[PDB]
Amino acid sequence: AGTVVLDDVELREAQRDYLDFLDDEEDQGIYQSKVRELISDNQYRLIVNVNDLRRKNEKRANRLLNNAFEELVAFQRALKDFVASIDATYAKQYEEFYVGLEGSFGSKHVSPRTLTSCFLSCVVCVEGIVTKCSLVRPKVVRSVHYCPATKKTIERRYSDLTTLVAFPSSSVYPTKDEENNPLETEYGLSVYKDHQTITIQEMPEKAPAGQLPRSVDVILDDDLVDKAKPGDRVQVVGTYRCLPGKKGGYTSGTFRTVLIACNVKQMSKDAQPSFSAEDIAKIKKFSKTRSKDIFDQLAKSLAPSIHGHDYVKKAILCLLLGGVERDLENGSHIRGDINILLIGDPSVAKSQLLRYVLCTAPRAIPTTGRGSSGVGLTAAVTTDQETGERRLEAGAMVLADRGVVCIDEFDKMSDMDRTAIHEVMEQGRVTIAKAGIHARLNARCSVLAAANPVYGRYDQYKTPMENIGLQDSLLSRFDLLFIMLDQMDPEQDREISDHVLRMHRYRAPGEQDGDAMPLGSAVDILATDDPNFSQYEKHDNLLHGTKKKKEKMVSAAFMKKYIHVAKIIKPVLTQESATYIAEEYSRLRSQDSMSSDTARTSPVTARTLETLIRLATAHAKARMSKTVDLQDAEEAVELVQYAYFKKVLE
């Protein structure tokens, strides 16, 4: 053969439609700005919301989603044309520009179980958990060969025939000149694109509870390779395709299918935020208006469904803001995470606070007493069994690096596990070694833990030392230790019960009118978008989640935005704050700090001094202060003074 096409009508029309869609200037300017932004960010993939195409062109959107390969070829040619129009040299740098897809794939949004053969050559959106990743390998796309005898230089092109027919002429590597002079390959002048394969499995929480998991293979090519690691929950948008078998004279009719990714995005749509100019202005005004009691307002707005526990909510706000790590020049390290332990009577809502943090913070990992044992909590070392090499496996605390581990039923863990937690809790790292490999994994996680005292209910007539069952070294790791009692006072009972009944009465606004909460039975989730991978008035409207209109509460979305901005602040200890903190620490170390019939809940060590510093720093962050002023220090000291002592009754 050797035929060329003379202005194919469908490809011409498609490229015209796609370039019309991309050239957004008479329209809102969205994708024209996006293409500028990839030029400036020095990238060559544009992610296109398919809903925008449906809005602009139903016919393109449907044809693209149902005939993915040639449509995507048209739309990448149109993208290259458009990029050249904006900037021809940038378009000259990259051989091809790519298009990823995003948005709402209605029936094309599948799971690895539901990705059947009717989606072949369609765009699909598959969600699952990465079970295995291959190594990132380079695949040669253009080899350059020098002939030392003739001084000639040769280039050979290898087209991407991953899912196409590949005749053997298409894969020969040149080794000889025409008259059998040897060629030497120019590695630096050749072009490679790196290639990866991952397997996506149906998420265990979404799989039918009875049977074995279903998987799909995914080919990742350049820009997309290291986007996912084993254990990650990801969306992969791409084309579902049959791979060719080898040449043979006989075939079973059986084909091996893969998904060729055009886009990979993490479930952590909570690990990447989006700030508009108005959002930033709102944050700045919220911080400037009341730069004194802003912390209290944020704390009291934290777990609105839980009544009470004002100090505990302040402490959780400090944990969510964190301190600042000290990275000394000689490589030494002081941690900047706050670890909190909640001891208390049954049914005082400490699991509710852990659940709130789980649904609120980014990179938050849940774990219960005996459901994460040994190597499931810190890292593990296993042997590859294919290459025979040792590999690392990240446990709960490595996966929560720069995040939170919410350890529920902390008292029901084994002592082996609780002593494995020590190094992560203080030095923020996991050190694991077998013979062929030794690593030091970063686990810079804060620990929010909830436990019951020994005897299940807290005895008020015993010291907190013997109600908590924890040894002093472990207790020292937790910088704040809250005893949450069930004081059966009638007045506090009235407060709690009125609150609880108001939350049991609340009905969502208009969305519901007397109806039930759907179970979400695995075909309903694929019907809509996944909120996990999905795409701000500073206050909530008041109805009866609160009794009366006397004090406003911060919006959850705005609070996420505000805390994300404030977490980056690095306030500095001022000399007055440092002197005050030092004096308070020396007072607190002393016996006069505790009266008679009051007892220490946890020991006061140098870790308590860093606790004061970290709490004061978090308080300063809440105000966006850039300095740790005396008010921050005294707030931290009252937190510590509250948590570290308990009156014992007779």
Partner 1 sequence: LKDYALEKEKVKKFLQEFYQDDELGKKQFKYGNQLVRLAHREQVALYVDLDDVAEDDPELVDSICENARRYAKLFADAVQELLPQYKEREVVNKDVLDVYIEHRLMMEQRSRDPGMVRSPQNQYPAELMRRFELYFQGPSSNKPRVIREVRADSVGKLVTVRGIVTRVSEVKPKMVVATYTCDQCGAETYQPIQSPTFMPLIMCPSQECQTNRSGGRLYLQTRGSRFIKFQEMKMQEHSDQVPVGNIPRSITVLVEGENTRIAQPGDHVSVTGIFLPILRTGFRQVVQGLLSETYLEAHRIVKMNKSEDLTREELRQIAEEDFYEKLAASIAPEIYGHEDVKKALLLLLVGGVDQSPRGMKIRGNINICLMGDPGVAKSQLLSYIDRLAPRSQYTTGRGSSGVGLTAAVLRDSVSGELTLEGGALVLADQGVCCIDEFDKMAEADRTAIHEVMEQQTISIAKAGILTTLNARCSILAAANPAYGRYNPRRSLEQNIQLPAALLSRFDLLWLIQDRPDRDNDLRLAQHITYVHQHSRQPPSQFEPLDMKLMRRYIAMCREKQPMVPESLADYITAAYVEMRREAWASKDATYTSARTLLAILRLSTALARLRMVDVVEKEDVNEAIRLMEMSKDSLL
Which residues bind to ligand ATP, rule: CB under 6 A? 305-308, 334, 344, 346-352, 426, 450, 452, 473, 476, 496, 499-500, 606-607, 610
Name the amino acid, one letter, at 258.
V
CB 401 within 8 A of CB 444: yes
Q: Which of 526, 325, 525 is nearest to 426 (CA)?
A: 325
Residue 166 touches which member of partner 1, Mg ion, its own copies, none, C-beta under 5-8 Å by kind: partner 1
Q: Is 41 helix (H, G, I), strand (E, B) or coil?
A: helix
Cβ at position 469, least distance to Mg ion in Å: 16
Residue 317 touches which member of its own copies, partner 1, ligand ATP, none, C-beta under 5-8 Å by kind: none
Cβ at position 492, least distance to ligand ATP in Å: 9
In terms of CB distance, is 53 or 637 closer to partner 1?
A: 637
β partners of residue 220: 196
In this chain, which stretch among 111-119, 206-214, 280-288, 351-359 interacts with Mg ion, using CB under 5 A? Answer: 351-359
Name the amino acid, one letter, at 463.
T
Where are any strands of DSSP class E within 507-591?
Answer: 572-573
Q: Is residue 88 marked as binding?
A: no
Q: Is residue 449 marked as binding?
A: no
Q: Closest CB to ligand ATP belongs to which residue?
A: 351
Residue 487 touches which member of partner 1, Mg ion, its own copies, none, C-beta under 5-8 Å by kind: none
Q: Is residue 96 marked as binding?
A: no
DSSP 176: B
Name the amino acid, one letter, at 256.
R
**Rounded (10°) CA dihedral 269, 274, 279, 280:** 120
Q: Residue 34 and residue 29: Cα distance in Å, rounded? A: 9
Residue 527 touches which member of its own copies, Mg ion, partner 1, none, C-beta under 5-8 Å by kind: none
Contacts of 293 (CB under 8 A, 6+ apart): none
Q: Is 592 helix (H, G, I), strand (E, B) or coil?
A: helix
Residue 4 touches which member of partner 1, its own copies, ligand ATP, none, C-beta under 5-8 Å by kind: its own copies
Provide the CA 579 distance to its chain's centre, in angstroms: 39
Q: H-helix or E-strand containing 65?
A: helix 58-66
User: Contact with Mg ion (CB under 5 A): which of 85, 351, 546, 641?
Assistant: 351
Q: Is residue 10 marked as binding?
A: no
Cβ at position 241, least distance to its own copies in Å: 18
Q: Is residue 14 marked as binding?
A: no
Contacting positions for its own copies (CB under 8 A): 1-9, 144-145, 151-157, 169, 172, 174
CB 154 within 8 A of CB 183: yes
Cβ at position 308, least distance to Mg ion in Å: 16
CB 303 within 8 A of CB 342: no
Q: Is residue 394 marked as binding?
A: yes
Residue 297 touches which member of its own copies, ligand ATP, partner 1, none, C-beta under 5-8 Å by kind: none
Cβ at position 243, least distance to its own copies in Å: 20
Overall residue count recorded for the chain in this entry: 650
Residue ranges at the known binding site for ADP? 352, 392-394, 396
Residue ranges at the known binding site for ATP? 522
Residue ranges at the known binding site? 352, 392-394, 396, 522
